[PDB]
Amino acid sequence: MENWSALELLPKVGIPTDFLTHVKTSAGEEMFEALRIYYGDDPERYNIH
Amino acid sequence: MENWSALELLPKVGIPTDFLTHVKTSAGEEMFEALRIYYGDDPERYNIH
Amino acid sequence: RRGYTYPFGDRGKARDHLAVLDRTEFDTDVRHDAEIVERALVSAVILAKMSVRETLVTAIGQTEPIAFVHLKDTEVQRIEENLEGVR
Amino acid sequence: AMEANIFCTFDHKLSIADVGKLTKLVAAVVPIPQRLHLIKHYQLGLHQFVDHTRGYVRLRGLLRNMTLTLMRRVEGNQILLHVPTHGLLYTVLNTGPVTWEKGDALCVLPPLFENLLTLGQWELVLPWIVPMPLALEINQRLLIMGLFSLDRSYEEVKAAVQQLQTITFRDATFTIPDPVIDQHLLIDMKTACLSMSMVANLASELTMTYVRKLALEDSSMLLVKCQELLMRLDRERVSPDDEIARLSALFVMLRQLDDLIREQVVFTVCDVSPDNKSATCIFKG
Amino acid sequence: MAAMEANIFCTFDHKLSIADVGKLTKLVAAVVPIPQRLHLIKHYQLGLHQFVDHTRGYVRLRGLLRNMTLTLMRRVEGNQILLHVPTHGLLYTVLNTGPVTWEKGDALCVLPPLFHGPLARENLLTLGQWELVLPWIVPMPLALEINQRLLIMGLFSLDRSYEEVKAAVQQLQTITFRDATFTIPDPVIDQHLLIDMKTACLSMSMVANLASELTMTYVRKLALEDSSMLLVKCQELLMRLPARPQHVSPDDEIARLSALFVMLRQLDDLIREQVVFTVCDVSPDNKSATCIFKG
Amino acid sequence: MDARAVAKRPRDPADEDNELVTALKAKREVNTISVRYLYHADHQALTARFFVPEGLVEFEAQPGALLIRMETGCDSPRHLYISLYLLGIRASNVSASTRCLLESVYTASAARAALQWLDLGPHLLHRRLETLGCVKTVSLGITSLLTCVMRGYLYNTLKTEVFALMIPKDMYLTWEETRGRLQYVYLIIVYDYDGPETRPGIYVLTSSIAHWQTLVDVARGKFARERCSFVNRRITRPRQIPLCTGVIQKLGWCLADDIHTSFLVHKELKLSVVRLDNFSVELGDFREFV
Amino acid sequence: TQNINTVDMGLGYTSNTCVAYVNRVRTDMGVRVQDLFRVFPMNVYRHDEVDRWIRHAAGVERPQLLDTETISMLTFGSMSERNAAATVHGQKAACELILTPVTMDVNYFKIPNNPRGRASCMLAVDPYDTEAATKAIYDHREADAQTFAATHNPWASQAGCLSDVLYNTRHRERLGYNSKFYSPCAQYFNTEEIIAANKTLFKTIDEYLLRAKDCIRGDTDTQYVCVEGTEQLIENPCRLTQEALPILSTTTLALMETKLKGGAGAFATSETHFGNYVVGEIIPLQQSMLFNS
Amino acid sequence: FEAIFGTFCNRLEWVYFLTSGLAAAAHAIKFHDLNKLTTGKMLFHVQVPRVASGAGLPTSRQTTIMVTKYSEKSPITIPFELSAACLTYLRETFEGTILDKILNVEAMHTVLRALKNTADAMERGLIHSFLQTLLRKAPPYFVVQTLVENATLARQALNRIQRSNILQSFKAKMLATLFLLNRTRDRDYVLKFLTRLAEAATDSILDNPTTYTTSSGAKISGVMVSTANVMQIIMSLLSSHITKETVSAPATYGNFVLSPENAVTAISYHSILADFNSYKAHLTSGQPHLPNDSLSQAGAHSLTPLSMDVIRLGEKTVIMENLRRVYKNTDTKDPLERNVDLT
Amino acid sequence: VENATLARQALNRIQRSNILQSFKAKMLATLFLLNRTRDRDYVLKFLTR
């Protein structure tokens, strides 16, 4: 549980991303706590309250 | 649940306060939606985290 | 049973007379049964006269007579002679 | 931006009263035989299909063929008709004998009974828009009245028909016309009744032979019960080419029933007002 | 996930010739079925050829074609094809391919192709033992006749000799419709027809059990006081054998008629094909029509 | 009528200024109402609003409930708009624990009266229920208002979020090991002819089968016991004519990957549901099968 | 559409209101009793002849409902009394009768009092103490807060007495009552609403401003309760104080005549002859206030 | 022949919320991001005074009481319908004949009329919604006067006996003053009753000394609003105290705007602190008191003069108004014309 | 005048019964004005009304 919409909206610093294994394998095999996946274009970031 | 400690730390606007009845009477007879009453000096406002 | 399926034009009076025809039961006492039989026959004769679209007594204080509906003359005569023999 | 309307013209000259009479029908359901861009006034409505030997069955079958259009605009020398497209929302005038309510499924029926517009030997007879249950009940009433048509010498049968004839719906009662006029039944209703009776009669004799053989095999143990029921109805009371002929006859009679057995939904309702004369509906093809 | 595609591009995984692209261009506006909607598909999944099989049943082919997806053909490019899956209720331009005449205002159905006359035409796409067999778009009366005759063949097959069924299948095969004769290929009694036979028997039996004495006796009573070619013909098809009706109740009669309507819908759905297009135009050469899609 | 006008691309309806903007610009008037953008102007969903008492709107306050119109026997409140949840108290396939949960939620005169009006008449359910769309908006009140979708997607005013259709778990049916891409949603009511009173089952089925006869074949296979019950009642009980073993009507389409499981919380009670994440409403009429 | 948000800038009540003027009575101020046969339409006597005879004597018609579905509809709520041909005295204010022992204290009626015979104002009870609220309302081994007797009407102040089952809405709906008909006794006898209204002082007055109000149809002859949102909610001070006001009544035409002969303020006094009495009104409504303007 | 003399139209007079005298009770603010926020809170911090005690007696602890007040929502809505005929004539032209131009102009004027009537209806709806909220928080005379009379004695939650006295006073003042103007027309009694109503209401925490002040004299302390009949009766009674005045009122709404810091905190925390920078500067400078409140800061800049009646009630100048013009010829009932029940 | 503000609609039964009551009351009250009163304030109010 994090503010994923804030991560989508707020500016970000670009880095080269070095996963040893595949990003979807790192995500699927639960390397990271607090994971959020979506496909296509999820419109909920446009919801501000 | 209100953040009373910020209310204590933040700057405030000094107003002439007018209750028809005693403050303790309008607090005790539930005029207000949210209340916090404490006696003495409550250290809660000092632990910023 | 036959009366409920019949297409009476005005079902209200039909169903009232069918209810009084439904309720009649003998209470195992000699004197009561003749009067309950008379009531049941009044209802049934009204219902039969309704079915054949014929007139019926509307005058207040009157009551439909206990009479055969559309039986032939010879059979009504034979039935009444038999009833007189029972008398 | 314009829309794809149909143009209609009247050969007859119109009075101001006629034009004002048309402007009241600016949301009606006017059916047209064929998808045409410029038509004459004769092709509007059911008046072209009226005949004195055919009845409700023939006109229902003819209505199912037509193209349904809503009147859109009325002016001098022109009437503009809109042909609606499936899945879009439209305003339609209530012209039947019954009140609509939200969520209804409406279907188009031949009419069973200021006024409507006549010019010469001409008349604008618009179809009836009723909810689907009322149409189904009306069709069944008409079919049963047709089957009773040969016992009409007795008062019991006539009382039965008078009970069939009156129908009650949402806060309205009306009497449908008897398919028997001048003591004899019209040829279209006669064919409908004859086809119904023939399919019943052919099924009664044909089905047992096949049910026996196929129930021997049937793993559903349903067809055995079917054969048992057939044995019961039997108890209450062929050359191969002739078997083919009777099977063909059964299926052709069923195809004859197809016009009456099922009716299409053409709208579904969502609007309420004291103005109840109209509602907004989505169109269905 | 991915929303369903509407415009579908098809590529031929085979060296096409000039004549192949020509007879492929002639098929613009034709309706072709596909098993899987995808933006780019391969030509193997085009038409009915993938389903033709040693089973050889026509009823199997009909059942497979029913569950397929219908799409219309759009313009042809060198070795590429565009297909468009239509929407309900819109207006479309449709080409006919079978030698069956259409009329302005009739309903159309999809059925596996028959064979006509000498069966002289097989110059469609062939590409290394693959073919573009398209389904036939036929008007409703012929479709009803085809389904009805298949069901009649199946029903008659039960408890008739092998040669008797042979003769019956021979005569029921041949259909004449709008002054042209068509023949059903491979009428074969598999299990797919066996299900239809089972439901036909159940539906007929329930019709017979539901039909009232009024319904049964109408035909007999009409025959006693009316005479016509219709009546004499239909009574010649029937078995051979005033007074008041002994039971009269409109409410029972209407309840019974409603149930009988449900059963008659059950039986009709065996021969009744689903309408895919409704026609309102014909090119005077009868090569194409403008139709409303109904799916 | 010239080649330049034929070859001219159509105007964009979004680039054109509205009727209100054109009028205010024509007289160069100004209004406090803001008319530059019109909400719901580009919504392709057809919607209607239904007024319903407070007693029925439990489990419907969250967008995604299927709205069904039931006809009472009487004249004054001729129809009630009930959801698939309240209808689940009548269903036979719903487990007794779920039924107790639902009965604990719907404890108002309106809901119990709905159930009584259902069980009171002789007709079957489907000859008594008309299916409206699915719901997405609620304003609360003693007489509450629900906006319902007749044909479209379920989404916000700005389509900034798109709603799913919620199916109570015991009512959900699936009949293939692997689903195809696109699958159609059906509502099935199947009648069991056990003993004195016909017992209905209420199901919502998602299958890729669109052709009517194939669907009715697989349904006759899946509900063979109900068919046997129908014929066995017909043989054992004459003169009480039954119609239909079941009815199917189609009420939408969805994608196979948009089916997920979820729970709905109300009165601190959890009702587990199956959700159709970008449901599109497309209603048919009831088709009865035997 | 426009969104408006309001936020209150006072730490007390920054606004006051008063009932400044009155300029007609909407009701007749009559003496026409409630017709229970409309309120409880399902009840019949078990014997046809006793039922028909009593209905004839009382002037009531046979219970006319298409029984099953229309009864469920009525128990959901129904407006089943036709209007009279003409009205000259406005809306019919029907009287609800509480049976009372013939030896009830006549001084009870001379001051504003709870008509059920035992006081039930929750402002006198500690907030949220339902045990003490229930004891104050019903426990007849405890002295009534107003008069310190157990009761003045045993048939009205107890749990499940005749008027408790008649006028308490929870008992009325175990009976088959028609909800649409307004009932004057309901505010005093809906003891569960009374228990729930037992809050603190400011919560009580806020609730009085919001929810403790009546709703009566303005256009019908009879007093039908209206749903929220169709017309204005009606203030009733008797819902807070939980008392009924004594109106000028008498047992003899002589004392009424001497009231009419009397000077101003005669209506406000309550003399008595031996067995015949007058109760004077506690506010000078009828005499001066209604007819001054 | 038949003669048609003049044809006439409704030359309606408009109402604007800020021109109303009721607007005195409001501090009206315009906020463009209102569709996005759903909560508004104002936090109060108050430490009571206390008195030194004698020997052997308990002493009073210092106690801080904090309260929060939350905003309430109440949107308003009104529709207007345009027919297909006006929509097509508004946009399509046919050879430009003078009849076609007539229809085009008529469609344009129909659109304009609909927009004008709708905007006026929105002004009236704002007046109506404000009056309803203001009513729902306003207790009657007997409640507030009982509170003001019993104010001094209670020093905590009410005793059993203290609230018995509260109830007794409720009943006495309920009967005594039920329909004021019918019971008496005595000039002094009515003057003192209105002064009691004016002095009973507590002060608002927003002080805005430049708004609603009369040409010469002094600040207006409140508004007194009633039906036209009641105000005509009162003005006939107390003309000795009532005078016609010209009052300076804010010409337009005050605009509240989100700052960039506010945008950051709204994106990240779903929370906005009004006037973030004033807080941060006062927080790092070590200043315990802000000078002004964000609602006050957002107030309007311009004043316009408008003429209205005022009455003097014990060194309080309040406004007298009737809202008959808002509700005249409309389909909605005046909230101040009411029904009261007595049993 | 007194009843004007109470209905923007066709009068219902109660409203017109109130109208009737007012008719009768005022008819009895003001039938021979100058013979009943000579009060300067009352006649000025009457003429103003």
Residue numbers in the entry:
A (entry chain H), B (entry chain L): 1 to 49
C (entry chain Z): 89 to 175
D (entry chain Y): 3 to 115, 122 to 245, 259 to 306
E (entry chain X): 1 to 241, 253 to 306
F (entry chain W): 1 to 290
G (entry chain I): 1078 to 1370
H (entry chain I): 50 to 392
I (entry chain J): 197 to 245
Question: What sentences appear in the manuscript?
Answer:
Composed of a diverse array of proteins, the tegument is an amorphous aggregate sandwiched between herpesviruses’ icosahedral capsid and outer envelope. We resolve atomic structures of portal vertex-associated tegument (PVAT) and identify multiple configurations of PVAT arising from layered reorganization of pUL77, pUL48 (large tegument protein), and pUL47 (inner tegument protein) assemblies.
With the aid of our VC1 PVAT model, we interpreted the comparably lower resolution features of VC2 (henceforth also considered representative of NC2). Despite the lack of ordered binding/low occupancy of a subset of pUL48 and pUL77 heads, VC2 CVSC still contains two copies of pUL48 CBD and two copies of pUL77 CBD, all well-resolved and of equivalent density strength. This indicates that VC2 portal vertices do retain a full complement of pUL77 and pUL48 and that although certain head elements may not be orderly bound, these are nonetheless flexibly linked in the vicinity of the portal vertex. VC2/NC2 portal vertices do not exhibit any features comparable to the notable filamentous densities seen in VC1/NC1. One plausible explanation for their absence could be that filaments in VC2/NC2 exist in an “extended” state [similar to that observed in detergent-treated HSV-1 capsids mentioned previously], as opposed to a “retracted” or “capsid-draped” state as in VC1/NC1.
